[PDB]
Amino acid sequence: GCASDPRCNYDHPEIA
């Protein structure tokens, strides 16, 4: 779910 966060896409790229 976090991957959906614009701040997560940068923190968890491997996920998104």
UniProtKB/Swiss-Prot annotation:
Disulfide bonds join C2-C8, A3-A16. The modification 4-hydroxyproline is found at P6. Residues 5-7, 11-15 are annotated as: Key region for inhibition of alpha-9-alpha-10/CHRNA9-CHRNA10 nAChR. Changing H12 to D/K: In non-hydroxylated and non-gamma-carboxylated analog; about 4.1-fold decrease in potency of inhibition of rat alpha-9-alpha-10/CHRNA9-CHRNA10 nAChR. Decrease in potency of inhibition of HVA calcium channels in rat/mouse DRG neurons. The modification Cysteine amide is found at A16. Changing S4A: In non-hydroxylated and non-gamma-carboxylated analog; 2.5-fold decrease in potency of inhibition of rat alpha-9-alpha-10/CHRNA9-CHRNA10 nAChR. Decrease in potency of inhibition of HVA calcium channels in rat/mouse DRG neurons. Changing N9I: In non-hydroxylated and non-gamma-carboxylated analog; 1.7-fold increase in potency of inhibition of rat alpha-9-alpha-10/CHRNA9-CHRNA10 nAChR. 25-fold increase in potency of inhibition of rat alpha-3-beta-2/CHRNA3-CHRNB2 nAChR. Expressed by the venom duct. The modification 4-carboxyglutamate is found at E14. Residues 4-6 are annotated as: Ser-Xaa-Pro motif, crucial for potent interaction with nAChR. Changing D11K: In non-hydroxylated and non-gamma-carboxylated analog; 5-fold decrease in potency of inhibition of rat alpha-9-alpha-10/CHRNA9-CHRNA10 nAChR. No change in potency of inhibition of HVA calcium channels in rat/mouse DRG neurons. Changing N9D: In non-hydroxylated and non-gamma-carboxylated analog; no change in potency of inhibition of rat alpha-9-alpha-10/CHRNA9-CHRNA10 nAChR. No change in potency of inhibition of HVA calcium channels in rat/mouse DRG neurons. Changing D11A: In non-hydroxylated and non-gamma-carboxylated analog; 5-fold decrease in potency of inhibition of rat alpha-9-alpha-10/CHRNA9-CHRNA10 nAChR. No change in potency of inhibition of HVA calcium channels in rat/mouse DRG neurons. Changing N9A: In non-hydroxylated and non-gamma-carboxylated analog; 2.2-fold increase in potency of inhibition of rat alpha-9-alpha-10/CHRNA9-CHRNA10 nAChR. 30-fold increase in potency of inhibition of rat alpha-3-beta-2/CHRNA3-CHRNB2 nAChR. Changing I15K: In non-hydroxylated and non-gamma-carboxylated analog; 2.5-fold decrease in potency of inhibition of rat alpha-9-alpha-10/CHRNA9-CHRNA10 nAChR. Decrease in potency of inhibition of HVA calcium channels in rat/mouse DRG neurons. Changing I15A: In non-hydroxylated and non-gamma-carboxylated analog; 5-fold decrease in potency of inhibition of rat alpha-9-alpha-10/CHRNA9-CHRNA10 nAChR. No change in potency of inhibition of HVA calcium channels in rat/mouse DRG neurons. Changing R7 to A/D/K: In non-hydroxylated and non-gamma-carboxylated analog; almost complete loss of potency of inhibition of rat alpha-9-alpha-10/CHRNA9-CHRNA10 nAChR. Decrease in potency of inhibition of HVA calcium channels in rat/mouse DRG neurons. Changing N9L: In non-hydroxylated and non-gamma-carboxylated analog; 1.7-fold increase in potency of inhibition of rat alpha-9-alpha-10/CHRNA9-CHRNA10 nAChR. 2-fold increase in potency of inhibition of rat alpha-3-beta-2/CHRNA3-CHRNB2 nAChR. It is found in: Secreted. Vc1.1 is described as having no post-translational modifications (except C-terminal amidation), whereas Vc1a contains a hydroxyproline at Pro-6 and a 4-carboxyglutamate at Glu-14 (and a C-terminal amidation). Hydroxylation of Pro-6 is not important for inhibition of alpha-9-alpha-10/CHRNA9-CHRNA10 nAChRs, since [P6O]Vc1.1 (Pro-6 hydroxylated) shows similar inhibition than native toxin (IC(50)=99.1 nM). In contrast, hydroxylation of Pro-6 seems to impair inhibition of HVA calcium channel currents, since [P6O]Vc1.1 has no effect on HVA calcium channel currents. In vivo, hydroxylation of Pro-6 seems to induce the loss of analgesic effects in rat models of neuropathic pain, since [P6O]Vc1.1 has no effect on mechanical allodynia. Alpha-conotoxins act on postsynaptic membranes, they bind to the nicotinic acetylcholine receptors (nAChR) and thus inhibit them. This toxin (native toxin Vc1a; hydroxylated and gamma-carboxylated) blocks alpha-9-alpha-10/CHRNA9-CHRNA10 nAChRs (IC(50)=62.9 nM). In contrast to the non-post-translationally modified analog Vc1.1, Vc1a does not inhibit high voltage-activated (HVA) calcium channel currents. In vivo, in contrast to Vc1.1, Vc1a does not show analgesic effects in rat models of neuropathic pain. The synthetic peptide Vc1.1 (a non-hydroxylated and non-gamma-carboxylated analog of Vc1a) shows weak inhibition on nAChRs composed of alpha-3-alpha-5-beta-2/CHRNA3-CHRNA5-CHRNB2 (IC(50)=7.2 uM), alpha-3-beta-2/CHRNA3-CHRNB2 (IC(50)=5.5-7.3 uM), alpha-3-beta-4/CHRNA3-CHRNB4 (IC(50)=4.2 uM), alpha-3-alpha-5-beta-4/CHRNA3-CHRNA5-CHRNB4 (IC(50)>30 uM), alpha-4-beta-2/CHRNA4-CHRNB2 (IC(50)>30 uM), alpha-4-beta-4/CHRNA4-CHRNB4 (IC(50)>30 uM), rat alpha-7/CHRNA7 (IC(50)=7.1 uM) and alpha-1-beta-1-gamma-delta/CHRNA1-CHRNB1-CHRNG-CHRND (IC(50)>30 uM) subunits. cVc1.1 is a cyclic peptide with inhibitory activity on alpha-9-alpha-10/CHRNA9-CHRNA10 nAChRs (IC(50)=766 nM) and a high potency at inhibiting HVA calcium channels in mice DRG neurons (IC(50)=0.3 nM). Toxin cVc1.1[D11A; E14A] is a cyclic peptide with a very low inhibitory activity on alpha-9-alpha-10/CHRNA9-CHRNA10 nAChRs (IC(50)>17 uM) and a high potency at inhibiting HVA calcium channels in mice DRG neurons (IC(50)=3.3 nM). Both of them show antinociceptive actions, with greater efficacy in a model of animal chronic visceral hypersensitivity (CVH). The cysteine framework is I (CC-C-C). Alpha4/7 pattern. This is Alpha-conotoxin Vc1a.
